[PDB]
Ligand binder design. Sequence first.
Ligand SMILES: [Cl-]
Ligand SMILES: [Cl-]
Ligand SMILES: [Cl-]
Length: 157
Amino acid sequence: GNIESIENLQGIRALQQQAPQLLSSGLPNEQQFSLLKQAGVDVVINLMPDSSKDAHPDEGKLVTQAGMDYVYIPVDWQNPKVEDVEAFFAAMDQHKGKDVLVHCLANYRASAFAYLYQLKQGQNPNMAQTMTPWNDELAIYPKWQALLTEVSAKYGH
Ligand SMILES: [Cl-]
Ligand SMILES: [Cl-]
Ligand SMILES: [Cl-]
């Protein structure tokens, strides 16, 4: 066979730094939680429901064993809610000045949440840049276009 699944050689799935103290990504494996700690990450905020087929059996244990704080905010991909975004904003406020990873499976939910947080915080994130993991899919997901629109409606820049 030829070289297979080269992405497994390329680190954390869908990793994208969003700010000096904020990472967004897809799903870190167990080893990568140790790497995250070594890179200075203090808090892992997980938006992927534990019922998902890709979920770790006990991510909180992996995170806490690696020396970090764990926050679990399960966001239903097929039913995002404003209250999910508010829970995320609340978790961020409880960890001010700390290095945070927000993640899901492939960095759709996490990049969107990171975007809305930076918007609310007055950081004027570039949406096209922040939400790179979405490529041109947002319009294909009306529930997500709705969420982004409603939360954005509350703020300026
Ligand atoms: Cl790795
Ligand atoms: Cl859907
Ligand atoms: Cl940006």
